[PDB]
Amino acid sequence: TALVCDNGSGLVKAGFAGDDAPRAVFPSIVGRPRSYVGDEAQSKRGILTLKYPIEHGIITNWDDMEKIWHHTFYNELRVAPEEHPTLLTEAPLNPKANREKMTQIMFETFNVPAMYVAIQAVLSLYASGRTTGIVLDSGDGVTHNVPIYEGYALPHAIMRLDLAGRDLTDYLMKILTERGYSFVTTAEREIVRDIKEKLCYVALDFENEMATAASSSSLEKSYELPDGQVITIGNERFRCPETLFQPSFIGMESAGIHETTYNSIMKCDIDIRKDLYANNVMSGGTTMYPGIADRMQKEITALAPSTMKIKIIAPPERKYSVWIGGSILASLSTFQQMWITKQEYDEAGPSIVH
């Protein structure tokens, strides 16, 4: 069958088209010593030097990406690339030189029979059962607002923000450190990330939650580290994700995710705006926070025209909506004519990925 590989800055999600979830999720890391990939690189981090091939959504080191792909096929999925068509994903605004190099490697280093490169945000939208709306995709390395009309991502209305999962982890590390604990290394990075996913949430009104959260005997929560050690965690639960709406928290002059959404909508024809406002779809691991849908509703309502219908959609599966949408798409009959093909490849070069 067809393979579906979602190359994220933090996590690769791979599996088989038609399946309801990936079969392999693993860090997008390559380790050489002073070559290992994935979980096996996390373990041996003392000895190994770690690199990340994918930076802010975009592949920037190809050899390590070659080891990531190699790992994916053989170790994770236990297949030959020769025998399976391959769906791959790129970040919106992926430069063309990039999608072409992706295509070449697949055809000449992996000799895949067929291939395709689809836009992550577009796959999430299809996965929500829509072909028009605006997606907010936020992962580990990048956040994008992607306006989409009838299956077409409007390249000039696309908003990018280099503030995502990893920065939030790093910010929590810092504010938990300010409190008295000590989280400064990468072997402490992966610990705090787990706290973030276990206990952080998003405040509806920030000022209000600072002034009022301390009344709940539930605000402060204990968390057992691997030391057997118990630390407490309070208002840093909502101080952490608040950076998405107030990037200044980590010295970023950039505007917050609610404003980029609005800005993005405002770069589209006034006549399709009703459609975008009512189809805000969130995807990516960093949209998991409880309270995030509600806070976006309130924020968008505040920016949008007075009588405008606003509607935030947040599917329980949004950590995976990209991989899912890739598996829906690669299963479709009407889609089968769209695979780029071995034959096609050697009579147009990589340029047939335009």
């Binding site: 949430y201 539930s218 329980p316 829906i328």
Partner: protein
């Protein structure tokens, strides 16, 4: 003159014909008489909405409740106030921030 209309034979009903032939088709047709890109796109978007209308994926729910429960625990308790207690708390905190700011202004100098 009206016979220029006669030269057009509306009675052929070739639009009728092509309409009936299109209705009977399946979302994807076999035999492979290559679709132009636009036909292919329009079919794709039709099939996408179709292969999606009834797909549930509710086996993805409550895969995150520790995070979700802890949040609710808090919002439960925090509703207990009133636009007063909290307006006066926001006003209190506000005044604190000033003192707090005036504080480290003297600190590091």
């Amino acid at each position: 003159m009206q016979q220029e209309l006669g030269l057009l034979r509306p009675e052929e009903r070739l639009i009728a014909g092509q309409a009936k032939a299109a209705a009977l088709q399946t979302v994807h047709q076999l035999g492979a008489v290559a679709l132009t890109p636009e036909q292919a796109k329009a079919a794709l978007l039709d099939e996408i909405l179709r292969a999606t209308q009834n797909l549930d994926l509710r086996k993805y729910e409550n895969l995150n409740t520790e995070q979700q429960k802890a949040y609710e625990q808090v919002q439960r308790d925090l509703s207990q106030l009133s636009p007063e207690t909290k307006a006066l708390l926001i006003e209190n905190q506000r005044k604190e921030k000033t003192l707090l700011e005036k504080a480290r202004k003297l600190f590091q100098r």
